[PDB]
Each structure stands twice: as C-alpha cells, then as structure tokens.
C-alpha cells in the first residue's frame, strides 16, 4: 500500500490535469477555450515526462501540438475531432503505468 500510494503522489495529479482538461475540449465550442485547455494540458504532459515510457509521452506531446495547431487556425470543430485520438493514447499510458507500479 505504501509503494502504490507513493506512485499516486508523483504522477497522479499530472494525469488528473490531462483528463479534466480533456473533457473541457469536447464541451467548449470556441477556439478561445480549446487553445486555452490544450495549453494547460501540454504543460502537464511535459511535467509528467520529467518524473520506453518517456518515449510514450513524445507521442502524446506530439499529438497535443498537432491538435493545438488546428485550434490555433480557428478550426474548433477539427480540434475536438483531433483531440479524440489523443484520448486513446492517453488511456494507453495509464494502463502501461499501472502495470509498472
């Protein structure tokens, strides 16, 4: 129990920031909020990488930039569609992390 709780104190808040902001993206309907949500999301993706698993976040950060680029142009509808593919990769890192801890 102590070892499992130690892992939560390290990276669990980072995964809470990623998931909570992943619901704002699918709920907001303007490029002002999609870009704002992804900005907070990326800062958490880099933060979690600091703490093969590291290469997993390079795919995650790379997909945030690709979705943030579309939302920067003002194509809010495409950004939400592109953030859907982000959820599957983010979910995979969860299952890979829980197996290691």
């Amino acid at each position, epitope marked *: 129990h102590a070892a499992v709780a130690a892992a939560e104190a390290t990276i669990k808040p980072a995964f809470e920031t990623l998931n909570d902001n992943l619901k704002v993206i699918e709920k907001a309907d303007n490029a002002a909020q999609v870009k704002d949500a992804l*900005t907070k999301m990326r*800062a958490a993706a880099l933060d979690a990488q600091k703490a093969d698993f590291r290469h997993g976040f390079d795919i995650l*950060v790379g997909q945030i930039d690709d979705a*943030l680029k579309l939302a920067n142009e003002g194509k809010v509808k495409e950004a939400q569609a592109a953030a859907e593919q982000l959820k599957t990769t983010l979910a995979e890192l969860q299952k890979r992390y829980w197996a290691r801890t």
Partner: antibody
Amino acid sequence: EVQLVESGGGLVQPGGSLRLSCAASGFNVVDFSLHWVRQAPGKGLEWVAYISSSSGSTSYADSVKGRFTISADTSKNTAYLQMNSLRAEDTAVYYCARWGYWPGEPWWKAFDYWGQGTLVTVFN
Amino acid sequence: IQMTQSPSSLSASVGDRVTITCRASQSVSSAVAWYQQKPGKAPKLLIYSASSLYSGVPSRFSGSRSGTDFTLTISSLQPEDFATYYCQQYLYYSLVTFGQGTKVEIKR
C-alpha cells in the same frame, strides 16, 4: 558557423508597407522553425510571428494579427515577414530567432541563435 | 500566458552574488530560458530548460526551479556580466512571452 542576417529595415511612412528578410546560412530552414521578435527602443523583447516551413503552419501575436504575413522560401533558404499598415508603435529592432522541432534536445534549446536585427522606424 | 520578473534593476559590485527571480502566471513545466542582452547587441542564450547550461558560457551562471518559480543565480560578477537579463518561457511555438528585464549595474 550558424548565423542569421536580416535586411529591409529603414524609414517607412505610417500606413506603408515594408518587407523584412532573414537570410539563414549554415543550416536548413526545413529543420528549424524561424521566429521574429522585436524590441521597442528602451523596452523588453516581444514576440511577433513564426513560421514552420516543414509543416507550413503560421501564427502571429494577438497585437499584430491580420497585418503581418510571414512566409518562407526553402529554395532561397530565407524567411520573409511582410509588414502592412505600420503604425507608430511598430518602431523596434526585429531579431530573427531559431528553434528546433519536437521531440528531442533541439526543442529544449529555445532561441539558441539570433540574427543581428534591423531597425524599422515609421516616420512622417 | 504572462511572465513576471523581479527585480527590475539591481546593483552589485565585482565578485558579489546575484539572484534574479522569475515567476510564471501558470505552470510551464520546465520550459524556461534566460538570455543576456549586452547594450546594443543581440541576446545570447544562457540557460535552457530552466536548469541546464548552454555550451560556451561561463559556469558561474546557474538556474533553478521551484514549482512555478524560477531563478537565475550568478556566483561572482566578473566585469563582463553587467547587462540585461530576460526570462523567457517557451511552452509552445505560439505562446512565447519574455520577462520585463533585469539590469545589473555597478555599485559605488
């Protein structure tokens, strides 16, 4: 040796148009996005615009969006910044930065190499 | 986002220790860089990733991170480090904001 040089700065009438070019030598523009940052006389640095020639993307600062149009030409290995409808607050020295591509170390380097910078002044 | 840098001007003589504080408005992970602009010339990179050291600069320059509060520390001001230091964050290509700028001056 990696270096960047600018040109085109000079006296311009308010509401006129000026073109700045950042001739990059020592590398390829396709491998590094080029950014433009300006410093008003006696103030701190400020971001202006950037282009990622490999992906074709382009973003501008909220203070200059809709006027400036930054384009890159890999054949001539340069990067241009077309400036239209210049106002009185656009007098500054425009430095041409450089930045790597995610992932890897070069992204973390940030603006490692800078240009000399050209002075753009609007005059009546 | 927004970046705040303090102090805006400090004085320290040769061999003194200088600490410059830079606090981001929101979390930027560890994407912070420090530049040194000599008067009338292009800026030079000193610290990248807020804790590393760019190759080719004297080893006295040091960086630190404490949550969202960043710090640049100079161990001993030789008579070549009296210039303006800017705190930059580079969270993304389209969200680059620089600090106000700290100027180091001689003391008498």
